[model samples]
Target: SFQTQHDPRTRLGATPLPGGAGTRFRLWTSTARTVAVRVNGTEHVMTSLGGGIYELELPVGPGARYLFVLDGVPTPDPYARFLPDGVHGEAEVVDFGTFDWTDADWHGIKLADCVFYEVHVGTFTPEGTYRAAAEKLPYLKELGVTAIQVMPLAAFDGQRGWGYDGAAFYAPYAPYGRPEDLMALVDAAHRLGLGVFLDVVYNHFGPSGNYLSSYAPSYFTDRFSSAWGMGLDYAEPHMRRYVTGNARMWLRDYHFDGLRLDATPYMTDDSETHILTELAQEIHELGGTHLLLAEDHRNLPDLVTVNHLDGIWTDDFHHETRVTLTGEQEGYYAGYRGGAEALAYTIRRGWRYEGQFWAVKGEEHERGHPSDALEAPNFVYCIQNHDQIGNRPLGERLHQSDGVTLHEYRGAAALLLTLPMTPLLFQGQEWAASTPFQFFSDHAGELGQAVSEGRKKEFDVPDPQAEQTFLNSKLNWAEREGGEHARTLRLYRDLLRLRREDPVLHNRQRENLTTGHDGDVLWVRTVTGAGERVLLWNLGQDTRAVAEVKLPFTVPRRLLLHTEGREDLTLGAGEAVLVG
Candidate 1:
């Protein structure tokens, strides 16, 4: 039975009744004048309740597949719990109580202790299934990441692609396995003392198989448009509930510790309370430490202070580091002058661009606000992510980019892992796996052709519709223990351990940290009860002497760890060190 203390209207999906008697169906649609539910080859007329809600009860339990017929046209439930056949198929009834959950004692992880590893299940392993990914928990635990941030799993049109184009809110992608398989994956993570954070897209639904408009045209409006297209009508009460309900279902049923909201700036809500605040308040009320993080490019400080989010994803560190390493000043990189000063500012102020004007397509625009008041932990930093690597024409990793020497890559890696803010590592990044994370999809017919042609026009790249594009993205596990990969893996393990064990490094207070630069050499210094520790980097191509580089503070220190295994004061080009 649906046991929400809130109004029953909040539950807008199929819920099996108590004692295995029947299942109750509820849907919201302002456009549909008549609605009928088809169950096991039989169709029953649904009663029209007020507020554009349709409700029906039937003597059907789990495993029965059903679809909603609106004005004689059939459409799958938008709130389907499982879509075994695909997005275009009927919704299957699922019993959330039947699965024995073993995470009764799992409370969750702290934001300060989190080391996130972002993963796309389709490319994380050869099998690319929930059960297959679960088998690798021990390896992740050993890798020192406290959490796994799985990419969007909401059922889309096809069996392959990055999951950002999600259609079904409740269903796990059928290709990854059934609903129970996902539950088992979370269960395994909890048992292994690792928290799981799901990446969810609330900005807009994918292009294909989104049938919300069939029921109610008001679900979306022309008032605003996101990067994808028309934006959702957040003013509509039912539409707002759709997003909040989906969020609760993940934390309550799937036992996920938190969620990473994708592209939050795209969602436009003109309500008294912003949708983000509503989500955070409701989810946090569920108790027991649930996290909420937003990926907002606008770099709004209110997202953390007013919206009550744990963190916001920042790209300043990444852009500066990428430009410094690769020397590519194209596109967004034009805004950043990559050097020791840029990196030092990023380290000291939590991010760069404090409402500074920069050029964007020949137009000057100001980005970011005064965020110096925000703590370091309020920002989530990453050197590489799905958008950074996969969106490229050839889908090359950072090491595969021209002029990015191994020494420079290692130096950047060392900085990312040791930063005070929460650090996110992409799949296979720890060992520098050679496989590329590309954009691949399986849309059929005209839609497929359009996507292929559009991608070619935009990127002039590989065929996104090709099966090989999907297959090529899978991680090669064998590379982790060999050659340069092994050495990179060792550096990551050691840096993570040092960050974990050292009190000075683990302290998340921005006030305790300061940064300085001398020519090509940059240093970040942090002080705590454990003592002062500084991370020194030689980002230039020439060897630097310790005497030439001025450290505003901590002049007297000894080397604690080094990327190049050198103990001398001389820093080789692209070498980084930890000193105390």
Candidate 2:
């Protein structure tokens, strides 16, 4: 029933097997003319089965390293989970069963009960190692963050990057430590009762030092374009297998709880079962706790529902909130013409631009959806994220806006964390860190120069060199210890505690929430088993007298989480009041 290849373990004809007993392995490369599977020093030239699947039968062993020599050059296996040392370096054969998993008794978290915090490993700490990040788990746990969303750790071109330009899809970047180190980080988080979600980039590969094209042209398609490069050819038979198989490999091998799919709007596949749906089904069938989230700008409801994904990031909520608070009528913010009215509606409904005219698209784009009874768990709201702050022209936050005082910033923060949807916090947003998070890259020479220039041109801003961009984006951790930054940090801690302890703030049921607009102010209310909480925001420049609005629920008096002035009411510009 099987064919065997016997030769010297170090030679090209010997077959290598899995480390554990009863374990089996296979290789698949669609375009390789000749496929040779090598393990440790042993090599086996696989018989070509149809559809690019290769088979080899051999004894199981340990400390085995495996790879394939496509054509003549030796390359890392496409479906590899652990590149022990580095990409283009040694490809170690890791047994998923070998690692001591403490999370076996741990039941994964639910989406509704999560408060996600997004952190980039390189910038999150000075050491930039997995072990270093693990040390911060207790601090994050005390702050009420139920989950952690790590930016991509896949091997990229250089020493430093935003992790979007990842060339080696499977390998963990060596600078961040080895494969086991990452596992330790995950285990540590689970021990501290925190779920881990990783951000993955499958849309396109980086430009500098990428070698995948040399192995297979089917890796990408010229038919569609992405911001990074040519779109991945998901429609192609082998391409689909490549992408989907990679997704499974992460879950099955690395034991990640979930993935945040970056920029799915750029993906182009016109099959009966969309690639997203196929991936979702495969993940669900695998039988562990897993989630698939999409970061799509199109506001496609089907992506979350029809595709059977866990959720989709809702930028409409963030945009509307920003416009309502800052009143900046430029760029993509122009689409929120409803202003505070749109903000209120988004809290009641889900999206702000539903069936409305989009100034950017020059068409009345109909985002057809009714929110009267819909109860989808959309990743609905956030003020600070990598894209919003990092991709800005100068990386200036709302606090940097003219006429926005410290009190106004605090008011906005209060509203963001108290919303019904799960709240996400950007790194250092709690401390109001003055450090700018500008777009930075490590592509050197001509490619680097082009990126530096292109970034400025894209925003229609002045061109600064790549070095300056990189230098400016790095966080200054020294500032976190004392002064106003530390005080602001305490304020964030208090707000999070309030949100967690208050049962009314935990209510995510759409029917239990109400929203309304009064002049330039947006009023939002949420009811729980305990009581009701009301949020009143004045978006205008001038202060208005506190008027007794018609009551939805009888509120005798409310605890002031944040406001412009003391009791007796001396309201200032851009003020907000939270009452219970």
Candidate 3:
């Protein structure tokens, strides 16, 4: 059931007039008794349109810079569409309708059928611009990636960041390129038959220069807390409209195919209709049938239902695989460290912990309600993302982790691609990128650091502020030409092709999979109208012979692909094999 709330966007921000004579200015400030639109060193008194909407018909055309004056103090619009001089500058009127789009023949690629490649645009290419990233679209297409989920591009306070602290929800980061440049990138991706999903952060605004609470306190809630400061008041009608409308704006005006909402569980909504459901509904209502994905860890089945989002970032698969590869269990990784048995459940069914006692959480949290209503492909699985890698002290890739080798990566690759869940690869993971994706940023908000000396180092051990840190995170695209990187790329290409061309393996039968594990090996069996395929994964250091393995089926089987050996099927340690 979807909720039908009224559209409160009439009082949001600057919009160009029909005849181009001027722009319509509207700023929402219930706290202020008087408001004015400041443009070209002039303040024009705005007529209150009631319901806290201050409006005016300014005779200034597009490209005019403007800021709102609340009772006398000038403040940037909370819904600024463009900030040409970073988040600290005046809000510029943006016209996305003028951009030319050439993706008419391209329909959106569904998240359920996509091979996701997550990227941070600033570090994705040497140039680190939209045009430069657009130039690499052909490479991803050839690699068989159906969609690319880019990190958040919303305008933030600094020259660089992870984009989680974005303050302007509508404006694209100026450093990346103009607002039109992002549209061009999306348009280019569509023309190449590659869907683009923009990562969006709405949980909280960035610190410093944010004027939302200064003008209207309703935007944030004091009831709950996020990793950052106070959480967004998603329970309020106007706030809900702002959140959902921001999502629609990206997919509609920018022409992005979908949105991967960042850390949605932090939204902290307690309404009868979850704000996510309403956002999904509002976006779907706009037509084109776009996908809605979330980075929610709650694992609530509603998140995967038809009423809400299309999928979630299922971290269980990554955690179990990580434990099986490395014996390290420090933090939350402790919950998922039972060897092959822990992995067998995730391989067969999607989530490892389903309403079970989670000692790490120290509570019997109701997690992951199982539902076959959506296929396992609706559960996006990945071995590495920004968090899994960057959260580490060194931001090392799984391949660089202690005891992790190419053999282990190969084994994980097979399971990732062939599994029923949709697969996502972090930027250079397919090529086994040498560059470390460290947690470097340009934020001025850490302890003992003066905001004057510039953004302080987030870490002293690695010196996150050092120029070398940002330089080291850049992908060495030239490495893909030869050596192990080329081989790893080829392996990814082959596995993706196999998933696309094969019948039984691509059936997406998550519910049909039956799992069993030997001493250190886990085998997954799936049967469909096409055929039955059994996959075996060795989690230990000893190779398992085919002669010693018992087959549940008496019929003869043939080996499909072996990770470290010939297709004749002598499974190596930290390897995987498929039998049909």
TM-score against native, each model? 0.97, 0.87, 0.94
Per-residue lDDT tens digits for candidate 2, residues 329-434, read 7777777754557778777777665555566655445654544433535654788788888767887666666555666677677777778777788877777788
Clashing pairs in 1: none
Q: How many steric overlaps does candidate 3 have? A: 0
Candidate with maximal lDDT: 1
In angstroms, the error of model 3 at 118 is 0.1
Instruction: Output the lDDT of residue 567, model 3.
Output: 61
Give stretches of model 3 more than 4 Å off: 1-11, 361-368, 371-374, 445-460, 554-557, 565-567
lDDT of each: 0.86, 0.70, 0.80
Better of 1 and 2 by TM-score: 1
RMSD of each: 2.1, 4.9, 2.7
Order candidates by lDDT, high to low: 1, 3, 2
Per-residue lDDT of model 1, residues 163-251, tens digit only: 97898988999999888999999999999999999999999998877888888888889988755567898898677878888888899
RMSD of 2: 4.9
Q: Is candidate 2 or candidate 3 better by TM-score?
A: 3
